Amino acid sequence: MREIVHIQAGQCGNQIGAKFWEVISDEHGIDPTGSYHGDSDLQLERINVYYNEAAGNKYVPRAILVDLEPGTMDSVRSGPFGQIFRPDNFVFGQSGAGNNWAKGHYTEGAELVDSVLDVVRKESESCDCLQGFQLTHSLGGGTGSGMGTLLISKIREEYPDRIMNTFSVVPSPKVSDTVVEPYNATLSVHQLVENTDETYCIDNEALYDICFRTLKLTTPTYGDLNHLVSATMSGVTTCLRFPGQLNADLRKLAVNMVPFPRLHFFMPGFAPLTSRGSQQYRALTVPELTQQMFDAKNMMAACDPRHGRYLTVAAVFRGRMSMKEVDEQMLNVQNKNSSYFVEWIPNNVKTAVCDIPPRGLKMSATFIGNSTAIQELFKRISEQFTAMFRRKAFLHWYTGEGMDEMEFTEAESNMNDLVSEYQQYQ
Amino acid sequence: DITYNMNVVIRCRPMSISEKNDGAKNVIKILENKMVVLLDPSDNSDNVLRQNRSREKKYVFDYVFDENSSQEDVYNNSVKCLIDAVIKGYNSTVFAYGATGAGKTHTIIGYKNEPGIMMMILKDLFERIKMLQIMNEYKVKCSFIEIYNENICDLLNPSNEYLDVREDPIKGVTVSNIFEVCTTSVEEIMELIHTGNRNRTQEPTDANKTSSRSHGVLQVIVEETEKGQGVYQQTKRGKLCVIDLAGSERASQTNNKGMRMLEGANINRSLLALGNVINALVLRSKGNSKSNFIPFRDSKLTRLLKDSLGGNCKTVMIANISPSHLSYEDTHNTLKYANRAKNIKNV
Ligand SMILES: Nc1nc2c(ncn2[C@@H]2O[C@H](COP(=O)(O)CP(=O)(O)OP(=O)(O)O)[C@@H](O)[C@H]2O)c(=O)[nH]1
Ligand SMILES: Nc1nc2c(ncn2[C@@H]2O[C@H](COP(=O)(O)OP(=O)(O)OP(=O)(O)O)[C@@H](O)[C@H]2O)c(=O)[nH]1
Ligand SMILES: [Mg+2]
Ligand SMILES: [Mg+2]
């Protein structure tokens, strides 16, 4: 009961997905072969949420891997945990998208997509009651953004009543990796606005800050960064996988955190986060976790929560904890930091608690905030788009893939509207 | 510059023979043109209830039409000036509203029979326009679309299937691939629309044999130019828009069909979106402190209607209710919505 379907689109998305799978298999006591070697019966009770049971006491991720390039697939298959995936669930093209949203959405991606659709239909049929979909990808390139968006549109058309979740790695302001990133982000964000029910805005710059400042990590690799994201992902759906004292799944979270249809862009966070040295000089207690989570410098989106207000915040706690203590701490934070919370939604905080902690830790926390500061992310992007579009820079490539200028105009308008709406509700 | 103007009227249907045969009591009384009272049929057994007298539930309107009102009377005393606004180069919008089964389609649009005010709207439009045509050539174009599960059906020409909305240079809204018929008479547009009704998604629900599952949106464009076609012209394209709002639904207790539950939710959501858009437009028109974005984005209905709703336009909400206590709850909710559509405490 309550099966989730996982989709990974483009290189980054795939990489994050791999990490996610690795963590979750470890959590549920699943080895690199698909066999259960755990101790606790609780690890297998709700195994069906993320895994299909294959013949001969093995488990396989309900995961679809998508890319316009084959190399990524190979890299995944050769990775630790690569062999756990169903071979028929790898759907790859041969060409690539060349950082072009149009190639991913209209051309190469279009050709690819039917196969993916066929796979995912089968995966849906297999599951007794699919609660919904989780897509991991980025907005800045061509595949994850254009192809991903296309896929999402198709999915929603066939499953309009199911929950649609995306973990979207967004382009940061300073660390600009590509030149057409503004275009790709703009086009994809628009589509996300209409077709996702909740969107987790993850930002590389913020991750780097976390790694450098909070973990004090000498050399971050993408794997390390990805780990953080994976942890966050695991946090959200802990209530579907384990028992607890107060239980909240994907739907319950959405209903409590989304007051208006369009405002479904979250700034996620995780706690605790310490170095090796600073491990000894700390208190493993709920007050400390709470303190950590609400800090601006612990957000995985490059936005200052102190530049806006929290519309709603959901906190998900894992480990053996006193409910009273949890409640006290959340009330204290809202009373003390009154100015950071919208005053016309009393009790801006939703709490959920799962008894099963993550491995290595006795207590852990996951944060989901709907903050009006997310407007900053959109605004910058809009500005950059304007700067490009005013001089029609790089437009020709997109137009060569069948895209028309008017779409760009529309998307930009839409994003502007969204920004305005956030501002006004602040 | 939101200068939004919306009149709110309501038509009380005459109590039907079926309602009389079923013992219906008269919950609806009209005290004035400006107001209607719905007599909530409480048993009043408690002293508190007898003291409060909650039975007298008042709602605020510009013109409440009683049980004897006809299609011609609704036209003459409500949309008549909206037609004029279009003739004069402005946009205007009419919204039919009520619980499904309320008779919205027949009062406003018709379906071969019961011409509705839509016939009357076009009948005067074309008489005035044909006269004006002597100096200013007119092209009265007509489209008819279906807004269903946020997708748009071309009703006049179903071969375009389900369409999206796009922003124009100068950001008005166009439905892609919609058929536009240039007409000269009400007979042409009325038959065109009634034929188009054949392509609407409708189902035999418990509350209504013909319950619309969608918002039927008429877009009649009164395009004009001085007949001196070789001269530069500041032409007009006033749009006379009429919306058959999907009926409100709370029949999901028995409508357990997957699609009816989907449609129901989308209908109610978009009816509420319209409500929120209206509240915002009214607040801005009033000049309140609520300076913000009008949430036209909340539905395809409102995104499209933005072009008339946010400007120097005349709009009208025409609700449909019943005097019978047997449907008190539907009349109550219908009146409540309409009251909130107006947002004026004159009653
Ligand atoms: N947080 C992470 N970000 C990544 C990772 N790999 C790439 N990226 C970021 O994503 C962007 C590059 O995206 P992709 O390689 O996924 C583009 P994709 O392969 O999906 O389509 P193509 O345009 O066909 O290459 C850029 O901002 C990178 O800095 C990762 O492992 N973690
Ligand atoms: N006294 C007490 N209250 C509880 C307990 N568990 C949850 N609550 C309270 O119950 C309310 C939340 O409702 P739940 O019972 O968890 O929700 P539910 O009935 O399962 O409804 P859904 O999960 O929304 O389907 C809150 O006021 C909690 O504080 C408990 O063990 N004891
Ligand atoms: Mg790639
Ligand atoms: Mg419950």
Residue numbers in the entry:
A (entry chain H): 1 to 44, 47 to 360, 369 to 436
B (entry chain K): 1 to 347
Task: Give verbatim excerpts from the published study on this entry.
The microtubule-based motor kinesin-8B is required for development of the flagellated Plasmodium male gamete, and its absence completely blocks parasite transmission. To understand the molecular basis of kinesin-8B’s essential role, we characterised the in vitro properties of kinesin-8B motor domains from P. berghei and P. falciparum. Both motors drive ATP-dependent microtubule gliding, but also catalyse ATP-dependent microtubule depolymerisation. All the reconstructions show that Pbkinesin-8B-MD and Pfkinesin-8B-MD contact a single tubulin dimer in the MT lattice, with motor binding centred on the intradimer tubulin dimer interface. The interaction between Plasmodium kinesin-8Bs and α- and β-tubulin is centred on helix-α4.
MT-bound complexes of Pfkinesin-8B-MD in the absence of nucleotide (NN) were also imaged and used to calculate a reconstruction with an overall resolution of 4.1 Å with resolution in the kinesin motor domain of 4–5 Å. The NN Pfkinesin-8B-MD reconstruction is very similar to that of Pbkinesin-8B-MD, including the empty NBS and undocked neck linker. In both Plasmodium kinesin-8Bs NN reconstructions, there is an additional connection between α-tubulin and loop 2, which protrudes from the β1-lobe of the motor domain and appears to adopt a partially helical configuration. In both Pbkinesin-8B-MD and Pfkinesin-8B-MD, density corresponding to loop 2 is clear, well-structured and contacts the C-terminal end of H12 of α-tubulin. In the NN reconstructions, the overall MT-binding footprint of both Pbkinesin-8B-MD and Pfkinesin-8B-MD are essentially indistinguishable from KIF18A_MD at the resolutions of the available reconstructions. Overall, the configuration of MT-bound NN Plasmodium kinesin-8Bs in these conserved parts of their motor domains are similar to a number of NN states of other plus-end directed motors.
